[PDB]
């Protein structure tokens, strides 16, 4: 099923800024509830389970002028390599809380 509003989505990601890897990992989030930076949620819209893609997110849709000191510099364009690992419906409590819960 496709990534979209009220889906719980699991992604693997690599983050680069100016060709340097800053982070890599995996996470699950509830889509459409401001869990992620808006630029990456936009790029995730309608993606299929199993789909791999790249997203280049301008600072205005990420960490902006401030960045995130210690990780993301000011005015950084974020280059993401993403794999959509899993997509499922959110449970009632996930929807109430506005976040993802583990499955086990
Ligand atoms: C206690 C809470 C910690 C909780 C941490 C986790 C679940 C672990 C999760 C793997 C995050 C990583 O931890 C190793 C690490 O991922 C980064 O390195 C990174 O690659 C990144 O940019 N990602 C992660 C991959 C999805 C896109 C983006 C994101 O949207 O991330 C989201 C994010 C930071 C959004 C902010 C929220 C504040 C807004 O103001 C700001 O708006 C400008 C946008 C993350 C997922 C939050 O939803 C949840 C958290 O924060 C950040 C550079 C710093 C972040 O560590 C903190
Ligand atoms: Cl979440
Ligand atoms: Zn919702
Ligand atoms: Zn909860």
Numbering used by the authors: 1 to 104
Sentences from the study reporting this entry:
Peptidyl-prolyl isomerases (PPIases) catalyze cis/trans isomerization of peptidyl-prolyl bonds, which is often rate-limiting for protein folding. SlyD is a two-domain enzyme containing both a PPIase FK506-binding protein (FKBP) domain and an insert-in-flap (IF) chaperone domain. In order to improve our understanding of the mechanism of SlyD and of FKBPs in general, we set out to analyze the kinetics, energetics, and structural basis for substrate binding and inhibition of SlyD from Thermus thermophilus (TtSlyD) using 15-residue-long unmodified peptides, which we reasoned would be better mimics of natural unfolded protein substrates than the traditionally used 4-nitroanilide tetrapeptides. In total, we obtained five structures of TtSlyDFL and three of TtSlyDΔIF at a maximum resolution of up to 1.4 Å.
Finally, we also analyzed binding of the S2, S3, and mutated variants of the S2 peptide to a chimeric TtSlyD construct, in which the IF domain is replaced by the flap loop from human FKBP12 (henceforth abbreviated TtSlyDΔIF). In addition, we carried out co-crystallization with the FKBP inhibitor FK506. FK506 binds in a similar way to all three copies of TtSlyD in the asymmetric unit of TtSlyDFL:FK506 and in both copies in TtSlyDΔIF:FK506, but exhibits some structural variation in parts of the molecule that are more distal to the binding pocket. The binding mode is similar to that observed in the FK506–FKBP12 complex. Specifically, the pipecolinyl ring, which mimics a proline side chain, is inserted into the center of the hydrophobic pocket, and four hydrogen bonds are formed: two to the backbone of N35 and I37 (V55 and I56 in FKBP12), and one each to the side chains of D23 and Y63 (D37 and Y82 in FKBP12). Most noteworthy are three potential interactions between the C9 carbonyl oxygen of FK506 and CH groups of Y13, L15, and F128, which are reminiscent of three putative CH–O interactions observed between FK506 and FKBP12 residues Y26, F36, and F99. As discussed further below, this variability is intimately connected with interactions between the side chain of Y63 and the peptides bound to the FKBP domain. The FKBP12 flap loop inserted into TtSlyDΔIF in place of the IF domain adopts essentially the same conformation as in full-length FKBP12 in the case of TtSlyDΔIF:FK506, while it is partially disordered in TtSlyDΔIF:S2-W23A and TtSlyDΔIF:S3. It furthermore shows that the pipecolinyl ring partially overlaps with the side chain of cis-P29S2 in both peptide binding modes, but is in a roughly orthogonal orientation relative to these, which enables it to reach considerably deeper into the pocket. In addition, we also found that FK506 forms two hydrogen bonds that mimic the β-strand type hydrogen bonds formed by the peptides.
